[PDB]
Design a protein around this ligand. Structure first.
Ligand code: DHE
Ligand code: DHE
Ligand code: HEC
Lengths: 434, 536
């Protein structure tokens, strides 16, 4: 299998608009923090959609099948990475936002993130690849590749050499000027300090194998991530740079996305995950100072719509916990979302009731069996969007739900809305509000 | 790797096959004679890459000719020297066209299988039980015999000859001076308890297929806690329990080159030192040009600093203050300086010489320049001095202050001691026997740093030993604990007579010659006190 190093990255690196030629203030009249960046998967595009008016402001060409959008800490720069390893950086301040720089970082990739420590706004971006097993730290204004690190190495437990440790989720610390890198097959979480790329400080945390996705707790101090194939949640303290806990969720194949933080009426601050392998939702306590007896313990587990869930969501202004069932084989389940009333949760051991929102039905799609995927809130936390993902030559939609009432707010359809998948609100992504 | 039996791969289009016997004969030759320059994976090191994609384009005739006649640039003439028969030359040319099967990894399971604790810590002495002066003992490698000799520093008596791994490369001592660690070139580590009535190996372990370095934890408070070993093959280092040798943490060194940032599949671990400022090991990774500062305070949440340095890192030493690590990036003629307190690169300087080879080097206070560290060179006769005092001699710090000739090229080791006024330089690999069997000695007190070249006295070490027979090569000065006597090895072949020569440092005259039928191929010598304390 071919390697992909600095020479290869630099050959693919193009700066379309140099920093000095970009605006010094916002030159369009858009409401950038309420904008949604929506993947148009099979079109190799993204749509920038007004969070209040639902107007598609622009459709931009990107790498094929963008996996996620991430925002710089200032909210000015939009970063997307295709599954092919192509990264595009877009300047939202331009009169007509477009790609200002691009680069290829490997042959297979899923993650990108921006520096989020106070004082390091817009300084760096980082991308992780499945192939070659590596991550790369890039300049936050130009995408210049600055530091490439191989993730080949020893497994944490058996301590045997692994020739293919894929980089899974990448998050950014709010406590130290560090990136948080999950290395799947070796079961290591890397805390990479970007204050000095020549004298590179890292903390390689032995965790659990099969690390995938995860998120920070409400305080933004603790990183909670799924070692999915081992059904565990690994907790690392980003302030102290150390593993704090590893706990089994009781479910099969936890798949949080970035997860859902909320204040449980009985348990206090918790983070929740749903599962791909069963219908369960698990809650872990996230407050060692205030609720020490509940911290890092699995406090409750209860059913949602069905197996094949990918994303769980809430917002500080919402009383609701939304859970999709995207990969369920049954169209009636994959086309709907479960919604729990957080205010009604007692943690008495019973199974909280949920309301079933018929999201695909609300979108009115005649053909196929579209899959509903990934709740994402607007900046005010008053509306939540879901993608109604159908095939490239079929009819898809976005469905906007009024969070206060749980009623349909708006259906977004456009001929350009091809295979809509991930949706990222600028404000909630730049601030890690989830 | 050479003694490992492998399967003969089939031959693809346009290539001819080798029988099982032919392929195993070629494979043994490759690892015994070629991999040291061309790499275990055939990706190239001193010698060019020899992977099938490249060799199949060169063709059989080209390969056969190069192996037969060699070249002036460093590739031996295997065929015309008679080292390889005509049939073996062809076997190698054919072998290089065939796909190399993956060399064996050597992880935790394999290390633990090889790990033996002969005397549990609980069953060992609680105080020194022999009457030896351990701090003045010397641990001497008997290379080709796979042994070491423990020799009394004052009486010159061989106290014991212990069996170890083959061709021990160096001896290192725990910070307390109790435990003696040795590592053979095949990756075998032996730990010896010097407090026993009859010191012997108390624990042993294998850490790889090919290795050169071992070191002990030297941060105050961490005495005897850990040992670390580095391998050439697999490209990895391993931190082990300082009392039992239990393997605790194995780290691969495969990774990206610091400058071109390209993946390198075989970055060999070279020198390993121990910080006196932090609870860290200092690990040189040759091919990627990275110096790793590895914090052993927490092996689960492992903190490291990966310092971009210069490719071809090999050996080096700490300055007199034990704060700065000065190491040779030998093929690029540079010295790299790292601050172990702050954990950062502070300088990279060309020595003006070809292939600096300091060993741990030589620290002294130059009468006019201030604190300096010295290195000699394999590729020329020069001795270079670098300033090591950023606070007290600021303009001189990390600058090459002087460069002057010694006996000739082929130097490996330079040496001094705080109680000596002399700087000793060998010339082990010089082609001239008169030079290779002698050492140059400079008088530090007479150095003026006026730009002229300091004179040196030539000590005829091999002649003093009474050895001319065969090919005696003098190597590596090592002082006793008091810094009053300096020893040199007279390294002859295994079927020839060798010796150790003890020089009186005050008079620069012969003191004593150590000879013994057991003293086979004596190479490295390490005094317990000077090694435990990094006094050089
Ligand atoms: C490593 C990884 C992350 C974390 C990214 C980060 O931290 O920036 C992630 C996040 C994501 C997120 C992040 C949501 C969030 O709110 O953070 C989304 C929307 C997403 C949509 C999909 N992912 Fe994802 N995803 C993979 C990997 C990943 N997905 C796969 O290896 C996998 C299993 C298979 C694959 O074919 O790629 C897979 C399938 C999917 C989907 O089928 C989705 C729905 C669409 C698609 O194009 O493949 N993945
Ligand atoms: C990586 C390395 C170190 C640092 C050790 C540490 O930090 O603990 C070192 C040190 C050393 C030291 C350390 C002396 C000191 O005072 O620190 C000695 C005596 C030594 C005797 C030899 N070395 Fe050495 N040496 C190699 C590697 C190394 N040698 C080789 O790859 C090389 C070039 C070729 C080889 O075949 O091994 C090589 C040839 C030699 C010799 O020919 C010597 C004289 C004998 C021998 O067995 O090969 N090496
Ligand atoms: C270090 C001293 C070496 C040893 C031992 C061996 N080789 Fe070598 N080889 C070395 C160098 C520095 C070079 C570069 C070419 C030059 O001009 O010196 C080479 C080259 C070869 C080649 C040619 C490759 C090419 O030209 O692309 C071959 C086929 C080769 N070497 C084979 C080879 C074999 C089979 C060896 C074991 C018997 C061997 N080399 C030992 C350095 C060194």
């Amino acid at each position: 299998p071919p390697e992909f190093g600095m020479k290869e990255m630099r050959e693919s690196w193009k700066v379309h608009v140099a920093p000095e030629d970009r605006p010094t203030q916002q030159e369009n009249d858009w409401d950038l923090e309420n904008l949604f960046s929506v993947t148009l998967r099979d079109a190799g595009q993204i749509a920038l959609i007004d969070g209040a008016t639902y107007e598609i402001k622009s459709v931009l060409d990107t790498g094929y099948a963008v996996h996620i959008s991430r925002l710089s800490a200032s909210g000015r720069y939009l970063f997307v990475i295709g599954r092919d390893g192509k990264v595009n950086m877009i300047d939202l301040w331009m009169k007509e936002p477009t790609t200002v720089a691009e680069i290829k970082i490997g042959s297979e990739a899923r993650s990108i993130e921006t520096s989020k420590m106070e004082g390091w706004e817009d300084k760096y971006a980082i991308a992780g690849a499945y192939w070659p097993p590596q991550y790369v730290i890039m300049d936050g204004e130009t995408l210049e590749p600055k530091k490439i690190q191989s993730t080949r190495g020893m497994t944490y437990d058996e301590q045997e050499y692994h020739p293919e440790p894929r980089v899974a989720a990448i998050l950014a610390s709010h406590y130290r000027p560090e990136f948080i890198v999950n290395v799947k097959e070796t079961g290591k979480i890397l805390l990479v300090d970007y204050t000095d790329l020549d004298n590179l400080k890292t903390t390689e945390i032995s965790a659990e194998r099969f690390l995938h996705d995860g998120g920070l707790d409400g305080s933004h101090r603790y990183f909670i991530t799924a070692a999915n194939a081992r059904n565990k949640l690994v907790v690392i303290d980003t302030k102290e740079g150390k593993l704090v806990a590893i706990e089994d969720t009781g479910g099969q194949t936890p798949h949080p996305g970035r997860g859902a933080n909320f204040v449980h009426p009985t348990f206090g601050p918790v983070w929740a995950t749903s599962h791909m392998g069963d219908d369960s939702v698990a809650l872990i306590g996230t407050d060692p100072e205030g609720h020490p007896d509940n911290a890092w313990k699995i406090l409750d587990s209860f059913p949602a719509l069905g197996g094949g869930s990918l994303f769980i969501k809430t917002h500080p202004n919402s009383q609701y916990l939304y859970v999709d069932a995207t990969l369920n084989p049954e169209a009636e389940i994959s086309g709907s979302v479960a919604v729990f009333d957080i205010k009604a949760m007692t943690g008495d051991g019973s199974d909280p009731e949920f309301k079933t929102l018929p999201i695909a039905e609300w979108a009115g799609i005649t053909e196929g069996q579209p899959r509903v995927v990934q709740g994402e809130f607007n900046k005010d936390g008053t509306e939540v969007w879901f993608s109604v993902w159908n095939g490239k030559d079929q009819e898809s939609a976005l469905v906007v739900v009024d969070d206060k009432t749980l009623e349909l707010k708006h259906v977004i359809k456009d001929e350009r809305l091809v295979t809509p998948t991930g949706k990222f609100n600028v404000y909630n992504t730049m601030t890690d509000t989830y």
